[PDB]
Amino acid sequence: SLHDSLSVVKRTLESGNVVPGGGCVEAALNIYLDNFATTVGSREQLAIAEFAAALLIIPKTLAVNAAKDSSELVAKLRSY
Amino acid sequence: KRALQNKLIVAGGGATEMEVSKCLRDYSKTIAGKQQMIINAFAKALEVIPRQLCENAGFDAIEILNKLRLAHSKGEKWYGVVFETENIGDNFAKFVWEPA
Secondary structure (H helix, E strand, O other): OOHHHHHHHHHHOOOOOOOOOOOOOHHHHHHHHHHHHHOOOOOHHHHHHHHHHHHHHHHOOOOOOOOOOOEEEEEEEEHH | HHHOOOEEEEEEOOHHHHHHHHHHHHHHHHHHOHHHHHHHHHHHHOHHHHHHHHOOOOOHHHHHHHHHHHHHHOOOOOOOEEHHHHOEEHHHHOEEEEOO
16 A cells, blocks of 8 residues: 555656646636736637636536535635 | 606616626625626626627627727726727717616
């Protein structure tokens, strides 16, 4: 078990740059690109809004497979 | 007629419709859960009024509405849609008025 456990720790440490999971990146880009969409304001503003909102499917499906309500956690996670 | 009967007026022609939809998007940020996406859908449902005004008059719904979402988000709440010359503008100066 120590070899099967540390093996995950090995790859995590081997890369000196780590990213938080669980839907943090998809929500952070959704809120940031929402305000960045106003920096263009012609056409792509609708495309950027749809591109950023499309990232919410990743944290949504993680909650569905976990039996928890996705409409709650994903909405609460974005508000935080 | 309604100008004399009602002395309380709000800027129309897309002005008030955007301000109501503007603030409710910010109010939905404080509310978490399904009610957040429902209020966001309500504010998105308020966008059909200024949309159809541009589509029925021949104006471009993609450019004018997006440009309307810009200047209105810049701190001026009175920007409407000019029905004479296509552009975004203040209907309080253009005198498009409806009672509250």
